[PDB]
Design a protein around this ligand. Structure first.
Ligand SMILES: [Zn+2]
Length: 263
């Protein structure tokens, strides 16, 4: 039932089928990509990240059917990302996660042929030039997305806040209030990053993202990660299907340059 409104990660509506209704899927700046450190170039002009995330900005966590979405109030300017490869202020809007059916392959971006267990995406939009996320999403400099790798390790106290809510949003469409979320404390201690021009990794797959992938991963226990696979990509009352995997395969680099803020 693949369509312009119905897409997913299953056999009939997975990534390979996305181009059927979203032509840009075969574009020149698609994400994710494989980051080959041998091909990465240090750029001293890249600046450190300057981040401020107000714990009260988070408002709701819901099951979109494609992942869990923690939505933030982006009508105010309390949580913003500056610095890095960015010009101007990018306002925090959403946080979601990508994983795979097994712990050995779940991240979207790949590093030197290796897949981490999962990958967190923190979505921001240029509020200096655009009136809202929608208009920013259609501009090359419109979005800034921080990517954070998750690797299996000791239980993560910060991620636990999210896992504690999963049973309440098991079905697609379910939502529960989620605030007092210290997102900054979820990020790794080192803010060193790789950056390149890309796109949303889910339809509409718009090429408006300046990707900022942090080098240092954070840990998550196998049990915590398994909790995400217990979510359904289907709603209450519909035939059940678990969201066992929700990551897109690596896309052609097409001559793009991946830069490092560290050396
Ligand atoms: Zn994402």
């Amino acid at each position: 039932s693949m369509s312009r409104l119905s897409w997913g990660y299953r056999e009939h509506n997975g990534p390979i089928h996305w181009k059927e209704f979203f032509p840009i899927a075969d574009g020149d700046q698609q994400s994710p990509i494989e980051i080959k450190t041998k091909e990465v170039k240090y750029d001293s002009s890249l600046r450190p990240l300057s981040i401020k995330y107000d714990p009260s900005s988070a408002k709701i966590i819901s099951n979109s059917g494609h992942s869990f979405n923690v939505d933030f109030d982006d009508t105010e300017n309390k949580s913003v990302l500056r610095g890095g490869p960015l010009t101007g202020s990018y306002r925090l809007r959403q946080v979601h996660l990508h994983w795979g059916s097994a712990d050995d392959h779940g991240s979207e971006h790949i590093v030197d042929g290796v897949s981490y267990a999962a990958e967190l995406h923190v979505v921001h939009w240029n509020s200096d030039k655009y009136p809202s996320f929608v208009e920013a999403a259609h501009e090359p400099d419109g979005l800034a997305v921080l990517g954070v790798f998750l690797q299996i390790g000791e239980p993560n106290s910060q991620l636990q806040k999210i896992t504690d809510t999963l049973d309440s949003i098991k079905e697609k469409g379910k939502q529960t209030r989620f605030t007092n979320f210290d997102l900054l404390s979820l990020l790794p201690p080192s803010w060193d990053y790789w950056t390149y021009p890309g796109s949303l990794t889910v339809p509409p797959l718009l090429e408006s993202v300046t990707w900022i992938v942090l080098k240092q991963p954070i840990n998550i226990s196998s049990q915590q990660l398994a909790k995400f696979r217990s979510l359904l990509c289907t709603a209450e009352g519909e035939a059940a299907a678990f969201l066992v995997s929700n990551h897109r395969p690596p896309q052609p680099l097409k001559g793009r340059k991946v830069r490092a803020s560290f050396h």
